[PDB]
């Protein structure tokens, strides 16, 4: 604290050499300082996460020059994607500028901290809660992307099978029973559980899940086969 007192002090003095109002300059310098510190915190959270859990499934990049962090989740491509942390200037509202006057001044250079998760061929700006654990954020995004891919397979399903998207997952209906498809945030892998008997999933679900994980062919093709199999065996019994 005393350190920044002196350094800051030097800074405002030179500003006086050139006579540019202080209250802005100190606001700018010091807010951006806090943003950078939070970003640092997040980075150490993610690297800690890359060691503690997530080990096989998190890769972390901190960058100097304009210090920025990007996190690589689900390093395994799916039959690409990362999330970018970023400091950038929010332009002043034309209406904010008109309102601003004297003590309330828009003339201060001001900016926010924000994130945009990269997706194969797209970019989306994600609101950032001021109280957001880095783990919590990683979860949030992974679930979004989740829902997206799992709805994509649902569409690639067979047309006659009644499927339902809800509960963060997919429900494939088989004779008033359900197969439930989700994705684990960390692994980013497909998880097939059974409606009846949620604690022990039948052998053919387990074997399906293993085959999806092999990434040899689209999930939908497998799940289609598993639907027809599941039908047949239940009747045959």
């Amino acid at each position: 604290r005393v350190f920044i007192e002196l350094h800051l002090n030097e800074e405002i003095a030179a500003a006086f050499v050139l006579q540019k109002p202080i209250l802005p300059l100190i606001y700018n310098i010091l807010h951006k300082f806090c943003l950078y510190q939070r970003l640092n915190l997040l980075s150490q959270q993610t690297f800690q996460l890359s060691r503690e859990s997530w080990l096989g499934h998190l890769r972390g990049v901190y960058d100097e020059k304009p210090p920025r962090l990007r996190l690589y989740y689900w390093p395994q491509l799916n039959v690409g994607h990362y999330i970018h942390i970023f400091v950038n200037t929010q332009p002043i509202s034309a209406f904010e500028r008109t309102l601003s006057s004297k003590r309330s001044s828009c003339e201060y250079d001001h900016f926010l901290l924000l994130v945009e998760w990269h997706h194969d061929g797209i970019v989306e700006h994600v609101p950032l809660d001021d109280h957001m654990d880095a783990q919590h954020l990683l979860l949030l995004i992974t679930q979004k992307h989740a829902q997206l891919i799992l709805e994509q397979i649902r569409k690639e399903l067979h047309p006659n099978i009644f499927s339902e998207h809800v509960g963060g997952g997919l429900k494939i209906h088989v004779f008033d029973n359900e197969i439930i498809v989700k994705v684990n945030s960390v692994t980013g892998r497909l998880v097939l559980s059974s409606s009846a008997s949620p604690l022990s999933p039948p052998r053919h679900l387990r074997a399906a899940e293993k085959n999806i994980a092999l990434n040899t062919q689209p999930p939908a093709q497998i799940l289609n086969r598993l639907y027809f199999f599941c039908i047949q065996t239940q009747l045959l019994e």
Binding site: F3, I4, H7, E11, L25, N28, I29, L30, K32, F33, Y36, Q37, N40, Q44, E64, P66, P67, D109
Partner: peptide, 21 residues
């Protein structure tokens, strides 16, 4: 210690930003 070092990095980067401006 290196966390505090990172606090400094945050400051010096803030400063470089304000200087460029």
């Amino acid at each position: 210690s290196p966390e505090d070092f990172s606090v400094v990095r945050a400051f010096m980067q803030s400063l470089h930003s304000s200087k460029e401006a």
